[PDB]
């Protein structure tokens, strides 16, 4: 019952990836992963409403050759269960820049040194409705 | 590179898939495949500018267990190299409905009797700019 999975995205540095999806009404959290494949994620975007001991906190992390890196938590939380949320992601060799529904944007280190993002996957709590490449 | 590949779409009857992309300036043909998986397609949407003996011909077909079905060809070709083109495909139990860039619509029988579309793949000279699922 997982979410949408996309491969061969070929997102290049500077390109803006816009993803709009519906957060499940009973979601305790949701995930949007970006990277080379399921075991190599340059970005594990994980807004947690009430999950894993956290409340209303965005947790980001990287996964390299299967290994999870050091998590980074964001300063804001412009998300709510049972609503449509859109995030905009771009990257360069040093960092990924993530823009949230509230227009707030932060950076997450590009720990995989990715020069292209070909994989994206959402979990069962984030129903992707639209994906744009600009 | 090649073409975007999305799985776990879970597109149900009555739902529409909108795909917008850029037709290569020297496009020969491009494909949008929809179905259960790569070897089971309810719709192989293949606009051929100049390929396989076809000149500006939209060729559609189904693929059952790897075997191509009986091709269907349309009477219009609203695609132009070097221009953005959008197609809207609606899935229904009896037929899939395709709405072309200029509003022309045609149907293609759901030969595989799919109850949902979970696979989408793009190939050829068409750079996807955005996809909307519902
Ligand atoms: C600050 C901290 O240690 N928080 C942790 C969460 O990171 C942790 O969630 C895990 O996160 C990793 C990414 O690092 C994987 O996504 C893993 O699947 C998650 O469970 C949770 C639960 O283990 O515990 C704390 O909140
Ligand atoms: C008029 C006719 O029957 N032509 C066919 C070609 O269209 C066909 O090419 C393949 O067509 C399928 C769709 O059925 C895919 O688009 C595939 O990529 C094409 O190569 C060829 C080969 O099967 O046979 C006839 O020429």
Curated annotation (Swiss-Prot), chains A, B:
Compartment annotation: Secreted, Extracellular space, Extracellular matrix; Cytoplasm; Secreted
Residues modified as N6-acetyllysine: 12, 28, 107, 127
Alphabetized InterPro entries for the sequence: ConA-like_dom_sf (IPR013320), Galectin-like (IPR044156), Galectin_CRD (IPR001079)
Residue numbers bearing the Phosphoserine modification: 29
GO terms under cellular component: collagen-containing extracellular matrix; cytoplasm; cytosol; endoplasmic reticulum lumen; extracellular exosome; extracellular region; extracellular space; galectin complex
Tissues where the protein occurs: Expressed in placenta, maternal decidua and fetal membranes. Within placenta, expressed in trophoblasts, stromal cells, villous endothelium, syncytiotrophoblast apical membrane and villous stroma. Within fetal membranes, expressed in amnion, chorioamniotic mesenchyma and chorion (at protein level). Expressed in cardiac, smooth, and skeletal muscle, neurons, thymus, kidney and hematopoietic cells.
SUPFAM superfamilies (alphabetical): Concanavalin A-like lectins/glucanases
Modified residues (N-acetylalanine): 1
Alphabetical GO biological process terms: apoptotic process; cell-cell adhesion; myoblast differentiation; negative regulation of T-helper 17 cell lineage commitment; plasma cell differentiation; positive regulation of apoptotic process; positive regulation of canonical NF-kappaB signal transduction; positive regulation of inflammatory response
Top-level taxonomic group: Eukaryota
MF terms (GO), sorted A to Z: lactose binding; laminin binding; receptor ligand activity; RNA binding
Annotated ranges, domain Galectin: 3-134
Binding positions (a beta-D-galactoside): 44-48, 52, 61, 68-71
Keyword Secreted part of the UniProt annotation: yes
Keywords, ordered alphabetically: Acetylation, Apoptosis, Cytoplasm, Extracellular matrix, Lectin, Phosphoprotein, Secreted
Positions where N6-succinyllysine occurs in the chain: 107
Xref: PROSITE patterns: GALECTIN (PS51304)
Purpose of the protein: Lectin that binds beta-galactoside and a wide array of complex carbohydrates. Plays a role in regulating apoptosis, cell proliferation and cell differentiation. Inhibits CD45 protein phosphatase activity and therefore the dephosphorylation of Lyn kinase. Strong inducer of T-cell apoptosis. Plays a negative role in Th17 cell differentiation via activation of the receptor CD69.
Quaternary structure annotation from Swiss-Prot or TrEMBL: Homodimer. Binds LGALS3BP. Interacts with CD2, CD3, CD4, CD6, CD7, CD43, ALCAM and CD45. Interacts with laminin (via poly-N-acetyllactosamine). Interacts with SUSD2. Interacts with cargo receptor TMED10; the interaction mediates the translocation from the cytoplasm into the ERGIC (endoplasmic reticulum-Golgi intermediate compartment) and thereby secretion. Interacts with CD69.
Name listed for the protein in its UniProt record: Galectin-1
Organism: Homo sapiens
Lineage of the species this protein comes from: Eukaryota, Metazoa, Chordata, Craniata, Vertebrata
